[PDB]
Every structure is written in C-alpha cells, then in structure tokens.
Design an enzyme around this catalytic site. Sequence first.
Site, PDB file in Angstrom:
ATOM      1  N   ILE A 118       0.824  -1.207   0.000  1.00 18.30           N
ATOM      2  CA  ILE A 118       0.000   0.000   0.000  1.00 18.30           C
ATOM      3  C   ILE A 118       0.860   1.260   0.000  1.00 18.30           C
ATOM      4  O   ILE A 118       1.514   1.589   0.993  1.00 18.30           O
ATOM      5  CB  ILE A 118      -0.954  -0.013   1.209  1.00 18.30           C
ATOM      6  N   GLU A 119       0.834   1.968  -1.126  1.00 11.81           N
ATOM      7  CA  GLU A 119       1.647   3.165  -1.320  1.00 11.81           C
ATOM      8  C   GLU A 119       0.907   4.491  -1.111  1.00 11.81           C
ATOM      9  O   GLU A 119       1.536   5.548  -1.053  1.00 11.81           O
ATOM     10  CB  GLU A 119       2.238   3.134  -2.731  1.00 11.81           C
ATOM     11  N   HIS A 120      -0.417   4.444  -0.998  1.00 11.32           N
ATOM     12  CA  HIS A 120      -1.189   5.669  -0.799  1.00 11.32           C
ATOM     13  C   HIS A 120      -2.529   5.429  -0.113  1.00 11.32           C
ATOM     14  O   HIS A 120      -2.981   4.292   0.002  1.00 11.32           O
ATOM     15  CB  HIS A 120      -1.439   6.359  -2.148  1.00 11.32           C
ATOM     16  N   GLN A 179       7.370   1.880   3.116  1.00  8.27           N
ATOM     17  CA  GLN A 179       8.477   2.696   2.652  1.00  8.27           C
ATOM     18  C   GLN A 179       9.382   2.747   3.876  1.00  8.27           C
ATOM     19  O   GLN A 179       8.986   2.293   4.955  1.00  8.27           O
ATOM     20  CB  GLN A 179       7.988   4.082   2.222  1.00  8.27           C
TER      21      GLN A 179
END
Length: 272
Positions: free
Chosen positions: A124-126, A156
């Site tokens: 999940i990046e956003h 991240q």
Amino acid sequence: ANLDIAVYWGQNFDERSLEATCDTGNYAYVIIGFLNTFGGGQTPALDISGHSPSGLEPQIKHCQSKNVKVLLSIGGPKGPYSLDSRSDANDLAVYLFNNFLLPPGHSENRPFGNAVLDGIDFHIEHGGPSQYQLLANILSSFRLAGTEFALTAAPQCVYPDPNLGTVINSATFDAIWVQFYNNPQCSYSSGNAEALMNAWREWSMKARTKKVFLGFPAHPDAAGSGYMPPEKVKFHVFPAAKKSYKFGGIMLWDSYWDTVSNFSSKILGEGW
Ligand SMILES: OC[C@H]1O[C@H](O[C@H]2O[C@H](CO)[C@@H](O)[C@H](O)[C@H]2O)[C@H](O)[C@@H](O)[C@@H]1O
C-alpha cells in the site's frame, strides 16, 4: 550466509518468466505484483504487465513444487486502489480468500486458475491506513480458520509508515520488506549509509513482526534513488543486520532488473 531473498515479479511484459525466476534458486519468495485496482466502486483487477493470469497457473505450481513461496501483492506503486470503507475491506478479503488462498469451490472463477497462493503482500503506497487494518484482521481470521497462508507488507522506509504503520503495529504480518530506496532520508545515498543504517536500526527494533527484510533496487535504473551495490550491501549492511534476531534477509526490486544486473547472483556467490 543462508540468505533468503524475496523478489517482486510481474513488472514487465518482457521479463524472465515466473517459472524461470523460480528455477534460479535465488529466491525464497516471489511476489507477484499487482492487484492494483480495488475499492471505490471498482471491481478488482490485476496489472501484471500484460502477462496472462491463467497462463500463470502452472508456473505458480512449478514455483511451489521447488519450495518457493508465491505471494500476491495488493496495491503497488501506482494504481486506482483505495479501501476507505469497511465494506471495501470485507469485499477484498473474501475475494482474495476465495480466489487465491483456497482451492476452487467450483462456482465463480479465479484469475490464476486453480492455483493456490502462499499469501498476500500489502504494498500500500497511498491512501493512509484507511480500512487496511480491518482487511488484515479478516484475512488473519481466515489464516486461523484452516487456510495456512502468509501476510506480508512492503512499507516505505520512514518509521512509522504513513500507510501501513498502524497495521504493522498490530503484529499481524509474518514478514515485512522495508523499501530502502526512493527516499534519501532512509536509504543509501551519496556513498553514505548512515541514514540507511539508522533506519534499519529503528525498523529492526520497533517493527512488530518476526522477520524484517531489507528491500533494495536490483539495478540503478530500477529506482529513482537508493541503489547500493551488492558488495557494499554484504560488507556494510549484513554484519550489523545479522545481529538482529529479526533479520529475515533482503527483498529486491525486481525480477526484471535482477535478471539484467545479476544482483542476487552476486549477493549469493552466484547461487544457481
Ligand atoms: O481480452 C483482453 C485481455 O486478454 C488477455 O486475458 C484473457 O486471455 C488470457 C489468455 O490469453 C487469459 O489468461 C485471461 O484469463 C483472459 O482474461 C490479456 O492477458 C489481458 O491483458 C487482455 O486485457
């Protein structure tokens, strides 16, 4: 070093096939990315760079027969994915379970055919935490209802992660691969690994998981920044990391690049 290496696959139409990636003997995990569409009124969809999903069926089975764990990654670097509603979480959890984590129930269908995956990877990046905790809770419940599969995450490198930090705090993930790239504040840069080492220290100390893997780009072109040559990783990074009881190994981005660079072969002493 007994090093375990996790690698992402599916980023390029022209990449080395899934079966050939597993045949390298270089990886303990191959993470297929990505289910990059879900939520927000959308039906789920895969973006595996044009590879045939059904076509993956036998390849995945081959990988597993050679003891390589095959995961599906949800989200990804980019994509129209969200999970803001509790209903969204329930829908995605049931979808993933029925279709990828259980044998066919012979009714609807399954993208990868009758293959059964070894787990789900949260990339999940956003969107912030949204309802990802609930998704993990439901998937974890299934993990206890008879389907032994793994749950992993790819945060991240800034601790705590804005998107997965809270979920990670639940201790639900079997393993986590921190992306030590695309962020100078916590990855290698300018022939200087201080920022990287400080970040690793915090992740190995605070992440509530049994295994923490260090994620690196397999080639200078593979990421915007953070590439660290393999010899440097072995020399500079492993001695300190290995002192952690949570050191799981490394994650590479990605198979397409690793094939070109031979990064994993170099890290392992050429592990054919
Ligand atoms: O119809 C457009 C899509 O065709 C492919 O996917 C279908 O055909 C595959 C075999 O060639 C099957 O494995 C798959 O299950 C079908 O949905 C193509 O892979 C897609 O990218 C195209 O959009």
